Design an enzyme around this catalytic site. Structure first.
Site, PDB file in Angstrom:
ATOM      1  N   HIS A   1      69.444  14.669  62.817  1.00  0.00           N
ATOM      2  CA  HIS A   1      68.064  15.248  62.486  1.00  0.00           C
ATOM      3  C   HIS A   1      67.464  14.184  61.040  1.00  0.00           C
ATOM      4  CE1 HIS A   1      67.334  19.260  63.130  1.00  0.00           C
ATOM      5  NE2 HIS A   1      68.645  19.296  63.685  1.00  0.00           N
TER       6      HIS A   1
ATOM      7  N   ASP B   1      62.195  19.496  56.937  1.00  0.00           N
ATOM      8  CA  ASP B   1      62.608  19.761  58.068  1.00  0.00           C
ATOM      9  C   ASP B   1      62.749  21.533  57.905  1.00  0.00           C
ATOM     10  OD1 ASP B   1      64.167  20.293  60.347  1.00  0.00           O
ATOM     11  OD2 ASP B   1      65.815  18.339  59.493  1.00  0.00           O
TER      12      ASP B   1
ATOM     13  N   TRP C   1      67.677  16.413  72.627  1.00  0.00           N
ATOM     14  CA  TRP C   1      65.950  16.185  72.176  1.00  0.00           C
ATOM     15  C   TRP C   1      66.003  14.215  72.384  1.00  0.00           C
ATOM     16  CZ3 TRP C   1      62.255  18.571  74.596  1.00  0.00           C
ATOM     17  CH2 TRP C   1      60.787  18.349  74.447  1.00  0.00           C
TER      18      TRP C   1
ATOM     19  N   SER D   1      68.190  12.660  73.810  1.00  0.00           N
ATOM     20  CA  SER D   1      68.486  12.008  74.513  1.00  0.00           C
ATOM     21  C   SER D   1      67.708  12.066  76.168  1.00  0.00           C
ATOM     22  CB  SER D   1      70.284  12.212  74.768  1.00  0.00           C
ATOM     23  OG  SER D   1      70.758  12.079  73.856  1.00  0.00           O
TER      24      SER D   1
END
Ligand SMILES: O=c1ccn([C@@H]2O[C@H](COP(=O)(O)OP(=O)(O)O)[C@@H](O)[C@H]2O)c(=O)[nH]1
Length: 428
Positions: free
Chosen positions: A15, A114, A321, A323
């Protein structure tokens, strides 16, 4: 127009890295960013920040209250014992007074947060600072979560039968908090995506959440032995195999992948991660038969450098995500092996988009070496995979020409939010 933004990622490397990449794009638009996380997280990405950002990105430490079982070294999900996760989430909530004092000290124009820092939004609100959520995963993931919490029109997004059980256990075991966090986002929610990939899921998420969803783009970030070995191989002939930073292969999984790599007879680079020896974990004689045709890397490997290399021809991925955005930016087609969480849906998205082919498991959910080998060969070698190789090439060109168009839309949206929010504040 410029803003001073305090950015608050969840306490996982997965994150903070997208938050840092967003911070870099905003910095190049003359924003000043305060990137705020626990010291154990800041010390790490500290080293990966070019001096080009010395003026524009400042790291701000948010220590948590520590307990004997959760000292500051464990104030992160990276390498955290799983039983300590409720204690880490609690400690994060209890750092709220420390966070309020950071906000009082810095008084930023905007907070970007977040998925779960309700306490952080509330603190900014009490100081008349607006708050905008940034989702570091895609809109397919976000809109599925709303569909689950606020009660699905896309037939290409489905689950294999063997994936239902993991999904059911995950959702049947705080949802109200996740909805509230999204609901308190001021006007827009930012999301790591782009319309060419996710347009219609972006629109669906916007209708479900009642917020304008603003994509920020893919946010993609001396020769080592790995790169030296790659230099010796033919163009587009090597498959890179990595299952992310938070998943561990089961013993059975690891064995079949090893047999699949040998059956496939495609040069490979496979990063093997063990929980806290190599020849002991692989079938007898594996390394001896492979010889120079592959290498196994313990722990960590330079993923972006490998995917960039002209010798790389495929990516066996858990479909995390970050990658898959990196692979798409660098023009590498994906051999999709989703493992958990949002990964099945990412896999469905990439097959539909045309840049991935999935390794389908057996009814019982187990892997077969012949399925792994067949998909590696057709993506990297055989005529069956030309469409996926071509679409990956095409996507890479377009993203490289797109640059930072999405960032300009992000800046304009955030300036409007902050201006309106301040005009109303002058009324008190
Ligand atoms: O050996 C490795 C494994 C992972 N990564 C990086 O770790 C991130 C993995 O993020 P993703 O969301 O794809 O997986 P997650 O860790 O969230 O499951 C990406 O930026 C990869 O480039 C890397 O550089 N080297």
């Amino acid at each position: 127009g410029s803003l001073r933004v305090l950015m608050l990622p969840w306490l996982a490397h997965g994150h903070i890295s997208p938050f840092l990449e967003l911070a870099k794009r905003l910095a190049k638009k003359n924003f000043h960013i305060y990137l705020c996380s626990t010291p154990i997280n800041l010390s790490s990405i500290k080293k990966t920040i070019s001096q080009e950002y010395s003026l524009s990105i400042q790291l701000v430490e948010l220590p948590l209250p520590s307990l004997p079982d959760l000292p500051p070294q464990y104030h992160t999900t990276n390498g955290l014992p799983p039983h300590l996760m409720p204690t880490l989430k609690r400690a994060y909530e209890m750092s709220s007074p420390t966070f309020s004092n950071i906000l009082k000290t810095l008084l930023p124009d905007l907070l970007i947060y977040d998925f779960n820092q309700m306490w952080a939004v509330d603190t900014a609100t009490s100081l008349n600072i607006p708050s905008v959520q940034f989702s570091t995963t895609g809109t397919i993931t976000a809109s599925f979560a709303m569909y689950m919490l606020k009660n699905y029109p896309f037939p290409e997004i489905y689950l294999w039968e063997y994936e239902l059980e993991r999904m059911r256990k995950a959702w049947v075991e705080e949802g109200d908090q996740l909805l509230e966090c999204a609901s308190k986002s001021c006007g827009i929610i930012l999301i790591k995506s782009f319309r060419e990939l996710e347009g219609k899921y972006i629109d669906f998420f916007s209708e479900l959440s009642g917020k304008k969803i603003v994509p920020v783009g893919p946010l993609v970030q001396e020769k080592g032995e790995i790169i030296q070995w790659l230099d010796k191989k033919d163009k587009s002939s090597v498959v890179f195999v990595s299952f992310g930073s938070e998943y561990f292969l089961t013993s059975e999984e690891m064995e079949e992948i090893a047999h699949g790599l040998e059956s496939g007879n495609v040069n490979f680079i496979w990063v093997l991660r063990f929980p806290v020896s190599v020849a002991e974990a692989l079938p007898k004689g594996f390394l001896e038969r492979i010889g120079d045709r592959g290498m196994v890397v313990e722990g960590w490997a330079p993923q972006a450098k490998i995917l960039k290399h002209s010798s790389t021809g495929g990516f066996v991925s858990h479909c995390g995500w970050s990658s898959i955005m990196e692979s798409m930016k660098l023009g590498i087609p994906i051999i999709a092996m989703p493992m958990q969480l949002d990964q099945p849906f990412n896999a469905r998205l990439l097959e539909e988009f045309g840049v991935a082919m999935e390794v389908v498991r057996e009814k019982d959910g187990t892997l077969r070496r012949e399925e792994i080998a067949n998909v590696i060969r057709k993506v990297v070698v055989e005529k069956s995979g030309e469409g996926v190789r071509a679409k990956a090439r095409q996507v890479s060109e377009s993203l490289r020409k797109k640059g930072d168009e999405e960032v300009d839309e992000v800046v304009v949206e955030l300036l409007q939010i902050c201006r309106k929010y301040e005009l109303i504040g002058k009324m008190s």
